[PDB]
Design a protein around this ligand. Structure first.
Ligand code: F43
Ligand SMILES: C[C@@H](OP(=O)(O)O)[C@H](NC(=O)/C=C/CCCCSSCCS(=O)(=O)O)C(=O)O
Lengths: 47, 194, 56, 296, 111, 495, 114, 92
């Protein structure tokens, strides 16, 4: 997982490109192209 | 096993053969742990899916209050192109009565677009973790798509101060909730409360 | 005597004239009060029964 | 003097009616607006009852005679579980509410079982703080008979149960057992009416006891004076911020924080601490006010 | 001060037979509480017996004979002890100390 | 101070329970939906699955063509046979399969006759006794109308009408009748006389609840659109258990609303939510009962139950008086107005009361509908509103069509129905029309309205739905304590 | 379903018959169960409820939910036997062997029910 | 006696296919309302709630019990590939 990758949300399958990683409250968060934070454990890499 | 005393509402029910609760009323369970929020006192919400959750929590040993919203039916006025049919809202006194509880359990319906905006308006004034009990399978991300704080899927620009802490699907309005759903709700409350 | 009850008699000659004064003590027997708020602001009451104080 | 009734009408021009009630010296004990109709529990002097009936019929309102709209009732259920709470117990509480009373569900910690049922001292005192207690028991004669130790309180008592007739040394109303449906059959309605009649008779008897040696000030006017003086009572989030009992009041504010303010309230020419017993309540650390009689 | 609460049938007796109970002495003050009289009470005496309460005015016929009907002023909570259809007539609250101190020699004279 | 996020509370009245007229039961509005109420479904099922066959031509064929002698013993044997064959048992043709008896427990073949001597030596198990079920005068009237004729009532299983449509019932009954005839009298399985039996039982002696609607309407027989108002009046059995004419007319109104306005119009010719609050307005609270009792009191005070002959003046007087009273009641009591919030509900209730009053004054059903239409156009001027637009189509042409004699517009109100050209589309009219047709005869104390055979057939105590007190049965169904047939749980897996 | 209650208390019999019917209706279990018999022994606190189903684990879970609903609250010690007929004994005391024997008798009686 | 045959007839009886291209064209041109795959998804949600017994944002309206119509669905299909893959797969 890194900026510019392609990820999909496992629960719904929304496709987007990772914009930035913005840790908060000692917890990793992933920002996609839809300006929505996600969780790395609920995201996985696709090619 | 400890005594549980409820402050019954001060107003009576809906007629003779009707429901026992009244719209826009609050019944404090003294020690404030959980508040169950019912959209209306009607048969679609009261005693079929709501008092069942109430007695499940009260059986688990956790005191429960039940609040019936004055205007719980419909969609908020802030929904796209406004509301239709009816307007959903939360009163400041209702918000204050909710906010003195450790956790909130709220029962929602079928349509996803209604549930997301209703939850957003509800959490605009509620600052405690809440559990959404709905029928439809709704993902714990569509709330974040419109700005709601969510435990797993946070939004970049949060428009609410309340956190949707759990979503439970498969509870139908006006129908008896099976023991499995009650057990799931109790486990979520216990693990997200203490 | 425009209105009469078992507790007071009221006068309605000036029922739309405002006053902004509060004197909330007991409305005892034969007390003269002026209602200062509401639909009947300005009515003059004379009480025939000992009643409690009122903010209005 | 002040007979308490319930007015059911619309919200349109209700403010004028409230002004009339204030003018004649009545008090609005309860107010609730549902959508367009408002229910008001009002205490007005007896000499203005016909005047108020005439006024109500002008607004197309309805007067309902509430024989219990001055008391708070402790409905005692063995538990708050699915067996008793969501049905029967609510029916009893709501039927009590239908006649003006203020109910409180009391779910005993160890009330269930036959030989394992027990009642704590704290629950006993909490029940005793009320005016009358209604017990909602099961539907087996042996189980009820082997459960009399539960109903040990020096408060008027009405016991409800399944069997039509019981042999306990208390008032008993039959055909109201542990059920699972809403009470809507004719027999069940009749049993509810019988329970209401029993509690009404006990309350009227206690009213005569109180009328032998009347309190120095009525509880309703005392509540009105407290509302006028104390400015924290409109910030109470409880269902009934001040409860009107038979011979006192229940103030739902913290005792440790507000007992000194409550006691130092001057009514008439007396200080409240000299005419009433202000004490902490077992009910969520609230303030309980018990009026003294004119004898002392 | 006594006060009639339960209608039943004994209050109808009392209504005019209280003046017949005028100037009557205390009969007993035993565990069956303090009873006065004793004057005729023609109300049908039922062996069926109903529970009574602390300081409750009772017109029970002590001995199931119409002529010996006692003005039994109950002091303690009495369970099934007495007879009569339903002796419960009223409740004593005012002047409870007077009824407690009342002895056999003392009478109620004027009612 | 204006907070746009407070919202607006709505629907307070709809949260309160709905009482049912002349009962003491309170039910939710959701439980009065025809899909959620098993009692309304069973009402329609019982009406749909009923076919009356005159077993007199068949007896004549057996006597004069096949040389077979027909006696009460042979009729008893035939009844025994058909009660086994009609549910789906096998009588001839070795090696058949049979339907499960658990699915056809509601299937009965009953016999009634106006001949007392023949009814005397008949097995009381299969006999619908007119003498026992009807009072003496009503029994005599029904026997005089029916005559010395024998009829068979076939109630095919409800499952048959639920899987299939309503056109199945007559054919089912005809096949089973023919089979039972050829196996009970030991005849050849197929000859000319068999065709005579089949034709008799298929159309010559058959009585259908509803006629077919071919063409534009496109529906088979025994559908609610084919049931005339007099037939539905005769289905309701309050006339033989009560002497209150208003009560009889109002039970017919309740049944007509629940059948036509709910089932036929909100499902057969519409969909989705349907018209529940349009129909329940006529049988939930005593509003219509109070208006009808006022109409009867007024009529008996100035005219009498049949004291006048139908003229225009009496129609104007009674309809105007009742309409003015009903609208004054709506004005005086806001509870009544908020109960009947829609204008259509109010218009239908007031017009039904006016028509019932005119019928109780004159004893004529067409005068009743004339009064109904006068009430509608007077309501319109009183409140400057009638109902949803599209409601007063038939109410505008009504006055002209009520006493018309032209081919497309003339029909006695008993012979009218949902297929009457004006009545074919709009809700809020048909059940009240059936009630007016019944009230035309309740005024005269008649035993029946249009068909004595239907009245006797639905007086059967073995029907699943009790037609003596339709509102009580509707309330029972709303409270989930009505047992309905047509369920198939013996052939289904455990859930 | 078939509902019958064996109790010497008149009011208890009718009330608990209504309770059994309501608990069956709430779980939508009426058409999936052939018989439901309850034996009430209140003098010695224990109750027996037997279930004969028509003809998976979800159905069994619904059946135990039905037992939990019907049984009185105070009877918390419960044990069940499942051999195509589910029978459970509930009491506030530890289960005795005679109660289990009564349970198996009810189970065998329910098996031959037809 | 066979529920399979009864359901075979039931499934055929309760099926109606309606084309939605004239409706979209009338919405776009005459009514001045934009039609997008998101709006099509919204309409599909609405019709799926409303087809069995539902009443949209109207609690005061009588509705059929949801468990009574668990077999009711509203589905969509199209010969347009791009529109097909832009639509929700829940009801396609
Ligand atoms: C909400 C609508 C939208 C529309 O196209 N039709 C509605 C709604 C529709 C839907 C309700 C379900 C839903 O999801 O919409 C259905 C069931 C249509 C049908 N299949 O028969 C219905 N109305 Ni309508 N509708 C009714 C009624 C009414 C009354 C309400 C009067 C009022 O002022 O409150 C008025 C008609 C009138 O003005 O006379 C009315 C209007 C309206 N009705 C207008 C009003 C708003 C609009 O301008 O778009 N209904 C009633 O009068 C009671 C019977 C009720 C019908 C369902 C029932 O019988 O249970 C329902 C009948
Ligand atoms: C089959 C159909 O014929 P038509 O639509 O071709 O006339 C016919 N329907 C109608 O006539 C009209 C249907 C509308 C339903 C009644 C309206 S009640 S609520 C709407 C009030 S309004 O705003 O439309 O005036 C029927 O028999 O149901």
């Amino acid at each position: 997982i890194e900026i510019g990758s392609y990820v999909r949300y496992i629960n719904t399958g929304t496709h987007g490109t990772v914009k930035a990683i913005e840790p908060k409250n000692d917890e990793e968060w992933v920002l996609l192209e839809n300006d929505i934070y996600y969780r790395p454990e609920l995201l996985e890499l696709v090619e | 096993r400890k005594e549980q005393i409820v402050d019954c509402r001060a107003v009576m029910g809906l007629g003779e053969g009707g429901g026992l609760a009244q719209r826009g009323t609050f019944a404090e369970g003294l020690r404030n742990d959980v508040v169950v929020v019912a959209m209306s006192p009607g048969r679609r919400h009261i005693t079929k899916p709501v008092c069942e959750i109430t007695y499940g929590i009260r059986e688990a040993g956790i005191q429960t209050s039940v609040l019936v919203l004055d205007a719980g039916g419909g969609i908020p006025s802030d929904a796209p192109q406004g509301s239709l049919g009816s307007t959903f809202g939360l009163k400041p006194e209702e918000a204050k009565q909710v906010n003195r509880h450790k956790l909130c359990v709220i029962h929602f319906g079928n349509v996803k677009s209604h549930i997301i905006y209703k939850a957003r308006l509800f959490l605009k004034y509620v600052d405690i973790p809440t559990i959404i009990v709905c029928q439809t399978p709704v993902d714990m991300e569509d709330f974040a798509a419109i700005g709601i704080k969510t435990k797993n899927v946070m939004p970049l620009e949060s428009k609410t101060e309340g956190k949707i802490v759990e979503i439970i699907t498969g509870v139908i309005r006006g129908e008896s909730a099976p023991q499995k759903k009650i057990d799931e709700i109790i486990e979520s409350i216990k693990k997200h409360l203490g | 005597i425009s209105e009469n009850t078992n507790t007071y008699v009221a006068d309605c000659r000036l029922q739309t004239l405002f006053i902004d004064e509060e004197n909330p003590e007991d409305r005892d027997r034969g007390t003269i009060t002026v209602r200062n708020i509401g639909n009947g602001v300005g009515k003059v009451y004379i009480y025939q029964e000992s009643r409690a104080s009122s903010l209005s | 003097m002040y007979q308490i009734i319930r007015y059911e009408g619309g919200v349109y021009k209700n403010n004028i009616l409230k002004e009339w009630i204030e003018d004649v010296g009545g008090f609005i004990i309860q107010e609730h607006v549902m959508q367009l109709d408002v229910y008001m529990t009002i205490a007005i002097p007896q000499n203005e009852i016909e005047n108020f009936k005439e006024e109500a019929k002008k607004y197309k309102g309805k007067i309902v005679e509430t024989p219990l709209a001055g008391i708070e009732i402790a409905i005692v259920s063995p538990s708050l579980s699915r067996h008793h709470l969501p049905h029967i117990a609510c029916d009893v509480s709501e039927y009590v509410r239908k006649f003006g009373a203020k109910p409180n569900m009391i779910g005993l910690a160890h009330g269930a079982g036959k030989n394992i049922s027990e009642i704590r001292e704290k629950e006993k005192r909490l029940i005793q703080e009320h005016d009358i207690a209604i017990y909602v028991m099961g539907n087996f004669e042996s189980c009820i008979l082997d459960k009399t130790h539960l109903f040990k309180v020096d408060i008027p008592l009405v016991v409800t149960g399944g069997p039509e007739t019981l042999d306990i040394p208390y008032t008993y109303v039959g055909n109201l057992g542990r059920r699972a449906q809403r009470l809507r059959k004719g027999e069940e309605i009749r049993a509810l009416r019988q329970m209401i009649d029993e509690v009404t008779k006990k309350i009227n008897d206690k009213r005569m006891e109180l009328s032998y040696d009347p309190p120095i000030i009525p509880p309703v006017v005392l509540k009105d004076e407290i509302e006028k003086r104390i400015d924290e009572v409109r910030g109470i989030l409880a269902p009934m911020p001040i409860v009107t009992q038979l011979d006192g009041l229940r103030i739902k504010m913290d005792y440790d924080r507000n007992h000194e303010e409550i006691e130092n309230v001057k009514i008439g020419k007396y200080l409240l601490k000299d005419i009433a017993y202000v004490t902490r309540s077992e009910m969520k650390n609230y303030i309980l006010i018990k009026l003294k009689s004119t004898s002392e | 001060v006594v006060g009639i609460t339960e209608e039943n049938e004994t209050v109808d007796f009392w209504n005019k037979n209280y003046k017949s109970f005028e100037d009557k002495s205390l009969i007993w003050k035993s565990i069956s509480d303090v009873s006065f009289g004793s004057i005729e009470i023609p109300l049908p005496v039922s062996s069926v017996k109903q529970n009574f309460k602390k300081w409750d005015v009772v017109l029970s016929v002590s001995g199931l004979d119409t002529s010996e009907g006692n003005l039994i002023f109950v002091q303690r909570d009495v369970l099934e002890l007495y007879g009569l259809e339903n002796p419960k007539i009223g409740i004593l609250i005012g002047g409870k100390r007077v009824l407690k101190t009342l002895t056999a020699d003392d009478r109620i004279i004027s009612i | 101070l204006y907070n746009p996020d407070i919202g607006v509370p709505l629907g307070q009245r709809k949260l309160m329970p709905y009482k049912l007229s002349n009962t003491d039961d309170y039910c939710e509005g959701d439980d009065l939906h025809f899909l959620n109420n098993a009692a309304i479904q069973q009402l329609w099922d019982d009406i749909r699955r009923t076919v009356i066959v005159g077993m007199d031509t068949a007896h004549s064929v057996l006597e004069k063509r096949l040389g077979v002698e027909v006696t009460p013993e042979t009729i008893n044997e035939y009844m025994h046979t058909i009660n086994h064959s009609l549910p789906g048992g096998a009588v001839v043709q070795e090696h058949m399969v049979e339907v499960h008896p658990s699915l056809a427990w509601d299937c009965y073949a009953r016999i009634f006759t106006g001949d007392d001597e023949l009814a005397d030596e008949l097995d009381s198990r299969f006999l619908i006794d007119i003498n026992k079920l009807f009072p003496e005068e009503q029994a005599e009237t029904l026997k005089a109308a029916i005559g010395k004729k024998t009829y068979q009532v076939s109630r095919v299983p409800s499952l048959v009408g639920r899987v299939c449509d309503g056109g199945t019932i007559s054919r089912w009954s005809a096949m089973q009748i023919g089979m039972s005839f050829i196996t009970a009298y030991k005849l050849c399985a197929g000859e000319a006389a068999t065709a005579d039996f089949s034709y008799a039982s298929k159309h010559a002696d058959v009585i259908q609840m509803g006629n077919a609607l071919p063409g534009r309407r496109a529906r088979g027989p025994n559908e609610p659109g084919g049931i005339r108002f007099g037939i539905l009046s005769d289905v309701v059995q309050t006339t033989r258990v009560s002497e209150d004419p208003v009560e009889q007319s109002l039970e017919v109104v309740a049944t007509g609303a629940a059948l036509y306005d709910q089932i036929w119009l909100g499902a057969y010719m519409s969909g989705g939510i349907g018209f529940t609050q349009y129909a329940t307005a006529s049988y939930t609270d005593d509003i219509l009962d109070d208006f009808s009792y006022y109409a009867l009191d007024y009529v008996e005070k100035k005219y009498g139950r049949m004291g006048t002959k139908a003229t225009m003046d009496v129609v104007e007087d009674v309809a105007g008086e009742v309409t003015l009273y009903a609208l004054e009641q709506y004005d005086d009591y806001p509870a009544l107005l908020e109960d009947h919030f829609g204008g259509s509900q109010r218009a239908a209730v007031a017009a039904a009361a006016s028509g019932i009053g005119v019928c109780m004054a004159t004893g004529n059903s067409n005068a009743g509908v004339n009064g109904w239409y006068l009430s509608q156009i007077l309501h319109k001027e009183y409140h400057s509103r009638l109902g949803f637009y599209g409601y007063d189509l038939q109410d505008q042409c009504g006055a002209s069509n009520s006493l018309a004699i032209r081919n497309d517009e003339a029909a006695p109100l008993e012979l009218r129905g949902p297929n009457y050209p004006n009545y074919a589309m709009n809700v809020g009219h048909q059940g009240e029309y059936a009630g007016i047709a019944q009230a035309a005869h309740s005024a005269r104390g008649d035993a029946f309205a249009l068909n004595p055979l239907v009245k006797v057939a639905f007086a059967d105590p073995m029907l699943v739905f009790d037609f003596s007190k339709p509102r009580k049965e509707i309330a029972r169904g709303a409270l989930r304590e009505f047992e309905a047939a047509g369920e198939r749980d013996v052939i289904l897996p455990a859930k | 379903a078939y509902i019958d209650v064996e109790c010497n208390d008149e009011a208890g019999k009718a009330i608990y018959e209504r309770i059994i019917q309501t608990s069956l209706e709430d779980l939508v279990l009426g058409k999936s169960i052939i018989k439901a018999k309850m034996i009430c022994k209140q003098d010695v606190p224990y109750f027996i409820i037997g279930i004969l189903p028509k003809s998976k684990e979800d159905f069994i879970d619904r059946v135990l939910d039905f037992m939990n609903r019907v049984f009185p609250e105070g009877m918390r010690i419960r044990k069940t036997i499942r051999d195509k007929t589910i029978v459970m004994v509930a009491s506030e005391k530890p289960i005795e062997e005679e109660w289990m024997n009564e349970a198996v008798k009810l189970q065998e009686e329910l098996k031959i029910f037809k």
